[PDB]
Amino acid sequence: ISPIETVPVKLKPGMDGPKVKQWPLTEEKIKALVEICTEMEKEGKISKIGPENPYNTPVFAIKKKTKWRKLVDFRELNKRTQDFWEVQLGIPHPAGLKKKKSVTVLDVGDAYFSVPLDEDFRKYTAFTIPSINNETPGIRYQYNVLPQGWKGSPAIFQSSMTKILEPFAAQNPDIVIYQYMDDLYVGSDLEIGQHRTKIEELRQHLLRWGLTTPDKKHQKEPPFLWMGYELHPDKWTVQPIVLPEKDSWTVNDIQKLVGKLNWASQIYPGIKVRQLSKLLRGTKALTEVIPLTEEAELELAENREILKEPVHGVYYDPSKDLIAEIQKQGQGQWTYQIYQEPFKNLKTGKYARMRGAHTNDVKQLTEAVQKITTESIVIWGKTPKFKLPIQKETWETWWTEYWQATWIPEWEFVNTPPLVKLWYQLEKEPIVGAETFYVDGAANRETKLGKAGYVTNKGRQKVVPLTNTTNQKTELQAIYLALQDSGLEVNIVTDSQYALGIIQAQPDKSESELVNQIIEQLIKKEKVYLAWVPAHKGIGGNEQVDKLVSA
């Protein structure tokens, strides 16, 4: 008996409606509920019910410091209500919106109260206004419309709005309507007056279905404060960032901080958050005080300077190409912009994941491309052209020798250093006239003491003692020792599957300082060939250095 058709709702199988008792309230708060309810009753939103209804749900009356508002705690009913199709978890990104001649923002008043609720489900919405000091029975009501705070209200409203919009959307194909919560965002490339006429039509079309909308004098005007953004007619930017200054930082303080910095990364180029993020590694409690690293202090200072200036993003033109450009900012940190025209950026972003203890630059550049690809698909529905500071010779060599399959987009080389390059390449065949080191390392797991040694074809032998290490860390330090005491060309032979795997991956940045030192040596060297042999199998050079390090 409502124009809008209801969605059938069921409780989770085997559950009944909520039977929560109502807490007593003031005679003044009861006065607020009684008046609000008779208005809601007059409006058909709610109905008084007989005594046979066995369900209840608490109701409260609050006000802010001033007409009162009614509040219903549906927590128990929500637990017993079936699941619904998930409403929009994500929201549109301003850089994905297409530029429109005119844009109108309409909010729906009493949105949920304008949609009928399934008849068979209404019994479970019963609530009670308390009588003064239990002097009499309370007044039993139930809901006939979507209650605010009920589990199913957002999804059923959105679907009801969709169907209500379908007739108008047919008779007006050029008008574009976006839905979000109780809002409609309408855009046309028609004349401001013509567009203004169409808006007024949609308002009446919604009013005929019962949906209140604002008039031309009460409609919001640009700039729109929408979900932490500023939407101007020809520009978007984030709302102002306020990074606090503090003498001491809690874990929660840093999590707020990286969040705001992450938020600034979409339009502010060059934001970095790695050093600050490392502080939260193993962050036990939110109240735990974290001493700031010198690196985190510099990172935060660098962020403050970038934020001092103001930046804006532009809206999207489907007719112009989409181009993405990546720049390296520092060891492990990358930055990108996406643009259709040279200096008009649609959005910016960063990528700074190590994805492991050790990595190389070409691998990280490929990962940054992958992250942009996923992001472009989400926002614009396609992948962009890539302008990258790497040469085809560099990338081709890497992706050919790399043991993983990888997709290399179509990209052009842009000579704007720092250019991504391979700092070193291990030899693929052993070296003639280069000394052959047989390295080994050992560590007592209990005492945690160790040693790393080498034996060479030229007869050279050496053992260095190690204080606090592991079998793995010594196997790496043995390779470091051979690199330290070798000429510009060296053949190294290890029995360590661990150390071979780290080196064969050819990293150029690591979070282990020992590996960073091996990396520094590998660069200075002209030719390095690394060989592996099964340990404890009596191979000539491995047996000698094994016996040497074991003594």
Partner 1 sequence: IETVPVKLKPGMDGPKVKQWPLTEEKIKALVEICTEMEKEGKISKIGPENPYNTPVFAIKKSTKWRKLVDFRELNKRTQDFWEVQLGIPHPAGLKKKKSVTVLDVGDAYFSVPLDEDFRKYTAFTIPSINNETPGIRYQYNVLPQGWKGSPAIFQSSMTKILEPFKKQNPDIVIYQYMDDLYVGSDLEIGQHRTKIEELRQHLLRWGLTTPYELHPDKWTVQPIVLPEKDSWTVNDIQKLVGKLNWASQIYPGIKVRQLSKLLRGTKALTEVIPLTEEAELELAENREILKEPVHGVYYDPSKDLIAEIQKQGQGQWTYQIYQEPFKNLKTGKYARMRHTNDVKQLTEAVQKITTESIVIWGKTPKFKLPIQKETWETWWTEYWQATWIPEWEFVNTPPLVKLWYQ
Ligand X SMILES: N#Cc1cc(Cl)cc(Oc2ccc(Cl)cc2OCCn2cc(Cl)c(=O)[nH]c2=O)c1
Under the binding rule (CB under 8 A), the answer on residue 104 touching partner 1 is no
CB of 548 to partner 1, least distance (A): 11
* Binders of partner 1 in range 395-424 (CB under 8 A): 399-401, 403-408
Under the binding rule (CB under 8 A), the answer on residue 436 touching partner 1 is yes
Residue 440 annotated in ligand binding: yes
Full DSSP string of 262-295: HHHTTTSTT---HHHHHHTTT---TT-EEPPPHH
Using CB distances below 5 to 8 A depending on partner kind, what does residue 381 bind out of partner 1, ligand X, none?
partner 1
Is residue 531 exposed (0-12), middle (13-18) or buried (19+ Cβ within 10 Å)? middle
Question: Measured between alpha carbons, how far apart are the two ends of the chain, in Å?
Answer: 94
Give the span between the Cα atoms of 324 and 311, in whole angstroms. Answer: 18
Peptide bond into 409 cis (omega under 30): no
In the complex with ligand X, the residue whose CB is nearer, 97 or 129, is: 97
Cβ atoms within 10 A of the Cβ of 246, count? Answer: 11
Using CB distances below 5 to 8 A depending on partner kind, what does residue 226 bind out of partner 1, ligand X, none?
ligand X
Residue 253 annotated in ligand binding: no
Under the binding rule (CB under 8 A), the answer on residue 455 touching partner 1 is yes
In the complex with ligand X, the residue whose CB is nearer, 34 or 192, is: 192
In the complex with ligand X, the residue whose CB is nearer, 176 or 323, is: 176
SS3 labels along 496-530? CHHHHHHHHCCCCEECCHHHHHHHHHHHHCCEEEE
The residue within the footprint of partner 1, chosen from 47, 204, 497, 550 (CB under 8 A), is 497
Under the binding rule (CB under 8 A), the answer on residue 356 touching partner 1 is yes
Under the binding rule (CB under 8 A), the answer on residue 538 touching partner 1 is yes
CB of 163 to partner 1, least distance (A): 9
In the complex with ligand X, the residue whose CB is nearer, 69 or 98, is: 98
CB of 201 to partner 1, least distance (A): 21
In the complex with ligand X, the residue whose CB is nearer, 268 or 315, is: 315
SS3 labels along 66-115? CCCEEEECCHHHHHHECCCCCCCCCCCCHHHCECCCEEEEEECECCHHHC
Is the distance from CB of 58 to CB of 126 less than 8 angstroms?
no
Residue 546 annotated in ligand binding: yes
Write out the two tokens for 283.
């962050």
Using CB distances below 5 to 8 A depending on partner kind, what does residue 85 bind out of partner 1, ligand X, none?
partner 1
The residue within the footprint of partner 1, chosen from 86, 294, 305, 309 (CB under 8 A), is 86
CB of 103 to ligand X, least distance (A): 4
Element (H, E) at 116: none
**Which residues fall within 8 angstroms of residue 168, CB to CB, at 6 or more apart?**
201, 202, 205
Under the binding rule (CB under 8 A), the answer on residue 222 touching partner 1 is no
Residue 485 annotated in ligand binding: no
The residue within the footprint of partner 1, chosen from 90, 342, 417, 465 (CB under 8 A), is 90
Q: 155-169 burial, b for 16+ CB within 10 Å, e for fewer?
A: bbbbebbeebbeebe
Write out the two tokens for 46.
């709610």
Give the span between the Cα atoms of 475 and 498, in whole angstroms. Answer: 8
* Residue from 488, 452, 450, 490 nearest 470 by CA: 450
CB of 216 to ligand X, least distance (A): 16
CB of 195 to ligand X, least distance (A): 11
The residue within the footprint of partner 1, chosen from 338, 434, 499, 503 (CB under 8 A), is 434
Using CB distances below 5 to 8 A depending on partner kind, what does residue 222 bind out of partner 1, ligand X, none?
ligand X
Per-residue contact string for residues 367-396; x = within reach of partner 1 by CB under 8 A: x--xx-xx--xxxxxxx-------------
> H helices of 94-224, where?
153-171, 192-208
Which range, of 122-130, 231-239, 413-421, 537-545, touches partner 1 by CB under 8 A? 537-545
Write out the two tokens for 241.
């960032």
Cβ atoms within 10 A of the Cβ of 323, count? Answer: 17
Using CB distances below 5 to 8 A depending on partner kind, what does residue 399 bind out of ligand X, partner 1, none?
partner 1
DSSP state of 383: P
Give the span between the Cα atoms of 302 and 345, in whole angstroms. Answer: 21
Under the binding rule (CB under 8 A), the answer on residue 83 touching partner 1 is yes
Using CB distances below 5 to 8 A depending on partner kind, what does residue 444 bind out of partner 1, ligand X, none?
none
Is the distance from CB of 359 to CB of 340 less than 8 angstroms?
no
Give the span between the Cα atoms of 331 and 508, in whole angstroms. Answer: 9
Element (H, E) at 25: none
Identity at 130, one-letter amino acid code: P
Under the binding rule (CB under 8 A), the answer on residue 456 touching partner 1 is yes
In the complex with partner 1, the residue whose CB is nearer, 60 or 263, is: 263
Residues near partner 1 (CB under 8 A), total? 78
In the complex with partner 1, the residue whose CB is nearer, 425 or 504, is: 504
Residues forming contacts to ligand X in the complex (CB under 6 A) are 92, 97-100, 103, 105, 176, 178, 185, 187, 222, 224, 226, 231, 233, 315
Under the binding rule (CB under 8 A), the answer on residue 348 touching partner 1 is no
In the complex with partner 1, the residue whose CB is nearer, 25 or 352, is: 352
**Binding-site annotation, residues for Mg(2+):** 107, 182-183, 440, 475, 495, 546
